[PDB]
Each structure stands twice: as structure tokens, then as C-alpha cells.
């Protein structure tokens, strides 16, 4: 077992812990934990609507969403002092850039 893959499992547990416990029984009103995700979705939406500006602009809008959130969450866990570096494995992040 590796602590790094365990950290990725902790990341996916936080991903469960951002929307399921957020959404009180599918309510219209948009509670406080959902307001932040609303702001994130809007600041990525209005960003890439003007960035690539295509007629087919939204077709990579989930991708430009999900490539952000990994770096958004993995730099919220290494912020703990008693932690190991998550995204400071430069082989991994540079290989991600190579893939993209």
C-alpha cells in the first residue's frame, strides 16, 4: 500500500463530502455549502464561455471543470502541517500536462 494512493482515496471521499452531505434533500433554495459550488461553477462557466468562445464551447467545459478541482482539492489537504505533499510530485503533474 502507498500513502499517495490513500491520499487520492481521501480526495474522492472529500468529493463525496462536497455534494451529498451538502444537498439537503434536493432543495431549490441553495444552502450555504452549495453557494460555494455555485460560485465555482459560475466562475468557470463565465470564464470558459469567454475564453475559448466557441459555438462548441461547453463541450470541454466539464473537462476544464474537472482538471481544476483536482488541483483545488489536493492543495487543501497538504495545507495541514502534519501531512505529506500531494501535488508536489513533479513527475505526476508534469506527466498530467504531457497528457493534456
Amino acid at each position: 500500500l502507498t500513502t499517495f494512493s490513500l491520499y487520492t482515496i481521501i480526495v474522492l471521499l472529500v468529493i463525496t463530502s462536497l455534494y451529498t452531505l451538502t444537498n439537503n434533500n434536493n432543495k431549490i433554495i441553495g444552502s450555504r455549502w452549495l453557494i460555494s459550488q455555485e460560485a465555482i461553477y459560475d466562475t468557470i462557466m463565465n470564464m470558459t464561455k469567454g475564453q475559448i468562445g466557441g459555438k462548441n464551447w461547453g463541450l470541454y467545459f466539464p473537462m476544464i471543470f474537472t482538471l481544476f478541482m483536482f488541483i483545488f482539492i489536493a492543495n487543501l489537504i497538504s495545507m495541514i502541517p502534519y501531512s505529506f505533499a500531494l501535488s508536489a510530485h513533479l513527475v505526476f503533474i508534469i506527466s498530467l500536462s504531457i497528457v493534456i
Binding site: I28, I29, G30, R32, I35, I80, P81, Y82
Partner: protein
């Protein structure tokens, strides 16, 4: 050696609970009241349209 960064973390989160939490509280309350007021007002408006 590593608990001193933990002490900076605890003091910083205390400053967060002092400063950032009421601001995001007020932002969420303002947007909550705004969306609820608009969503109630549109319903009351077309209830009055039904009455018309």
C-alpha cells in the same frame, strides 16, 4: 519541530473564525434572502396575474 506550524495553523484558523466566517455568513444570508425574495415575488406576481 512540526507542531509549531500546527500552532500557526491554529492561530490562523482562530483569525479565520474571527474574520472570514461572519463575512461569508453575511454573503450567504444576503444571497439566500435575495433568491428567496425573488422566488416568492415571481410566484405572487403570477398569482395576481391569475386573479387578473
Amino acid at each position: 519541530d512540526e507542531s509549531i506550524l500546527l500552532l500557526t495553523f491554529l492561530g490562523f484558523t482562530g483569525l479565520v473564525a474571527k474574520y472570514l466566517a461572519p463575512a461569508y455568513k453575511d454573503f450567504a444570508d444576503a444571497r439566500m434572502k435575495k433568491v428567496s425574495d425573488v422566488l416568492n415575488a415571481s410566484r405572487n406576481k403570477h398569482v395576481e396575474a391569475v386573479k387578473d
